[PDB]
């Protein structure tokens, strides 16, 4: 099955930009159908970004213009966050869904900790 590669932690500068890497080697016969990034709120992950057939969707206005997800190379769905705030410190989850040629779906996810440094 696919494996998402995401570092354990990432540190970005206060009021600056950072990239949260999330990559995988695409497998033959696997079609990517959903990409989500989620921020962890206690026990509950909360979607901040969703990519599907219809395009990209940012889920909260506080991210509008600050949030971008790579789309150029298959297998790279890293998340770029600009103008980092102290409140952006959190665990983030990269979550990718694929469909196999028999219609079944496979989901993988992985967690990184975002640190923000003054």
């Amino acid at each position: 099955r696919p494996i998402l590669e995401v570092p354990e932690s990432v540190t970005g500068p206060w009021k600056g930009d950072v990239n949260l890497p999330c990559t995988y080697d695409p497998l033959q016969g696997y079609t990517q159908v959903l990409v989500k990034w989620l921020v962890q709120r206690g026990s509950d992950p909360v979607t901040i970004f969703l990519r599907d057939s219809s395009g990209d969707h940012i889920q909260q206005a506080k991210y509008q213009g600050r949030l971008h997800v790579s789309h150029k190379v298959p297998g790279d769905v890293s998340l770029q966050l600009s103008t980092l705030e102290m409140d952006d410190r959190s665990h983030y989850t990269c979550e990718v869904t694929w469909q196999t040629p028999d219609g079944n779906q496979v989901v993988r996810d992985k967690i990184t900790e975002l640190r923000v440094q003054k």
Epitope: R1, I3, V6, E8, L38, Q40, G42, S43, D44, P45, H91, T93, E95, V107, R108, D109, K110, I111, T112, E113
Partner: nanobody, 125 residues
Framework: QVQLVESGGGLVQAGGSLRLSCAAS????????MGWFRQAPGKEREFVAA????????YYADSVKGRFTISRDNAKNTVYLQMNSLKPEDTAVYYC??????????????????WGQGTQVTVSS
């Protein structure tokens, strides 16, 4: 860098019980999914059970559901596997493992970043 240490294995009579534990070193134990795998002589390693990060959702292989219980004590950086109604088919080396999956892929061995050294469990008749 993470170090995983299993404790609690050994010899047990069929129908009896054992508790395995795995102590992890590090600062952010609660943000790792923790899993148990086992390998019997002459077979491939297989999933037994897992407990996810944060809230701690539990996952069980069908062959152990109802008989095994997994839990974690985040104050102790420890995960526990309570093994009840043990059968001779449960004889194997049991491995503790730690990964940064969240809600998916918990049975996939490649989804774990750190592997303990494993402890023998033997169920006799």
């Amino acid at each position: 860098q993470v170090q995983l240490v299993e404790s609690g294995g050994g010899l047990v009579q069929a129908g009896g019980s054992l508790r395995l534990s795995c102590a992890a070193s590090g600062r952010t134990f609660s943000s790792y999914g923790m899993g148990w795998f086992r390998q019997a002589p002459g077979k491939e390693r297989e999933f037994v059970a897992a407990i996810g990060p944060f809230g701690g959702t539990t996952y069980y292989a069908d062959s152990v559901k109802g008989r095994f219980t997994i839990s974690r004590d985040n104050a102790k950086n420890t995960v526990y596997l309570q093994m009840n109604s043990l059968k001779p088919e449960d004889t194997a080396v049991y491995y503790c493992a730690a990964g940064r999956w969240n809600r998916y892929g918990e049975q996939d061995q490649y989804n774990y970043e750190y592997w303990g050294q494993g402890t023998q469990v033997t169920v006799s008749s």
